[PDB]
Amino acid sequence: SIPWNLERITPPRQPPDGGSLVEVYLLDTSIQSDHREIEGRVMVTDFENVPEEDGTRFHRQASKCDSHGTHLAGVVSGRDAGVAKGASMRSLRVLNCQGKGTVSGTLIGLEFIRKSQLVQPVGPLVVLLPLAGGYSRVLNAACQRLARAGVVLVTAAGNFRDDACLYSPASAPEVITVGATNAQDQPVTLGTLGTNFGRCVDLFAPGEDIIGASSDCSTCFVSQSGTSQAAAHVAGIAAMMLSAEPELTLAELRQRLIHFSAKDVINEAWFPEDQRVLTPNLVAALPP
Amino acid sequence: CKXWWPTYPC
Amino acid sequence: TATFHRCAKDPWRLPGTYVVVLKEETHLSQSERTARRLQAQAARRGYLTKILHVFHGLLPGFLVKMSGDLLELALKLPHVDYIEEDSSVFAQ
């Protein structure tokens, strides 16, 4: 009677307003802000910086354009199926209708978050980056600077069944990088690819068949899979941890995430041989 | 969980 | 000492737009002047440039739409730390 992923992050031995001191910024596609699951919980900023869609005859249907971001906003704070039901979210559009963005657009978005914070500070901030490109010196630098300024960043490890160190922002050490595991606590396969792995991943979290808001209708739900969904679980857990202990530094928060994670439940045989000792065998969970 | 529903499945 | 960088995944590159990153502690006034100096030097060589954005707050610098032919010139501008060609990011 509960989505498998919400049961999985609950200690083995549902918080109704968790994470209320924290604001989660989401850099993703457009969102269906009037979907009942997230209405009133997500504030759509005026920020938009996206490349044009590929194909001269592309049809911009809101239900399709909003799919990715709406589901992730639901995973973080959704009324029925969210992790941190009291967290406020602010959304920035950096991915187009096909889920594609640019490093420059993402940089301008990260700058917009810091500028917004300086103008009207609130509580601790968590920035969710459910996206990946190739290793980028500039994107890693901007992420490092925003983390050093006191902001918590969480990103997807990437869905390329590859070493996360070859992608950004996954490869930025100051960012919490999250891989995906399934209901059997095994790394997620996505077609011929799957979750990334290696020394740049901090931990794993549920990322297969995750029930969340569907932009097909105002009350619809759909299951989705990917390291974006796993990163959204960690952004929700981080919002809950920071709301309970608002004075936590980034290093202390990372220590809490590791301490409360389920340990040694992943069969390391799924990863390439040399990556087994480098990949953390941790699946995120809430504290008791 | 896998699927699609017109309301919250649980 | 300033260096140029572009995405190793060649299909994800976005040539023609570059992020010019200036040294740490470069002020916004200095970033704007450096962007205008790049446009003026490029124009002396017959090239059009467009400054799409000037960064300040996390990293100082600017986003410029221009021919990659101007990269040797741009790396010699005052305050430059490095230049990166734009590239794609994707929903995960």
CA-CA-CA-CA torsion sign (A199, A200, A202, A204): negative
Q: Residue A190, Cβ neighbours under 10 Å: how many?
A: 17
Pairing status of strand A23-28 against strand A193-194? unpaired
* Subunit contact A222:B7, Cβ cutoff 8 A: no
Among candidate residues C65, C9, C3, C5, the one with its CA nearest the CA of residue C35: C65
Q: Is A59 one of the annotated active-site residues of the chain? A: no
Distance from CA of A85 to the nearest CA of B (A): 15
> Which DSSP category does A16 fall into?
S
Instruction: Out of A228, A233, A243, A261, pick the active-site residue.
Output: A228
Residue A33 to residue A22: CA distance in whole angstroms: 19
Q: Do A81 and B10 touch (CB under 8 A)?
A: yes
Give the domain ranges of chain A. 4-283
CB contact under 8 A, A111 and C57: yes
Calculate how close chain A gets to B3, using CA atoms only, in Å. Answer: 6
d(CA A187, CA A267): 8
The DSSP letter of residue C21 is E
- The backbone torsions φ and ψ at residue A65, rounded to the nearest 5 degrees and listed phi first, read -55, -40
- Which residue's entry shows tokens 């003026």? C40
Which contacts of C35-40 are long-range, i.e. CB under 8 A and separated by 24 or more positions? Answer: C35/C62, C35/C64, C37/C77, C37/C78, C38/C64, C38/C66, C38/C70, C38/C73, C38/C74, C38/C77
Inter-chain contact B2–A219, Cβ cutoff 8 Å?
no
Q: Are A108 and A138 in contact (CB under 8 A)?
A: no
Active site residue A28: yes
Domains of chain C: total: 1
Cβ burial of B7 (10 Å; 0-12, 13-18, 19+) is exposed
Q: Which two tokens stand for residue A258?
A: 């590791």
The answer to whether the Cβ–Cβ distance between B10 and A2 falls below 8 Å is yes
H or E element in which residue C3 lies: strand C3-5
Q: What is the DSSP string of C27-73?
A: -HHHHHHHHHHHHHHHHHTT---EEEEEE-SSS-EEEEE--GGGHHH
* Token pair listed for A250: 């980034």
Question: How does C36-61 read in b/e, with b if 16+ C-beta sit within 10 Å?
Answer: eebbebbeeeeeebebbbbbbbbbbb
Which residue from C minimizes the CA distance to A169? C89
Catalytic residue selected from A35, A67, A68, A162: A68
Does the annotation mark A68 as catalytic?
yes
The widest CA-to-CA distance across chain C, in whole angstroms, is 44
Q: What is the resolution of this structure in A?
A: 1.5
Question: Where are the extended beta strands (E) located within chain A?
Answer: 23-28, 42-48, 88-93, 100-102, 125-129, 131-134, 152-156, 167-168, 176-181, 189-190, 193-194, 203-206, 210-213, 221-224, 262-263, 282-283
Distance in Å, alpha carbon of B9 to nearest chain A alpha carbon: 7
Which position has the token pair 């941890």? A241
Burial class (CB in 10 A: 0-12, 13-18, 19+), A191: exposed
Chains B and A touch (3+ CB pairs under 8 A): yes
Q: What angle do CA A131, A161, A213 make, to 5 degrees?
A: 45
Which CATH fold topology does A4-283 show? Rossmann fold (3.40.50)
| Neighboring chain C residues of A53 at a CB cutoff of 8 Å | none
Q: Rounded distance, CA A150 to CA A121, Å?
A: 12
Method: X-ray
Q: Name the neighbours of C, counting chains with at least 3 Cβ pairs within 8 A.
A: A
Non-local CB neighbours of A273 within 8 Å, separated by 6+ positions: none
Q: Between vectors from CA A72 to CA A69 and to CA A73, what angle results, nearest 5°?
A: 85
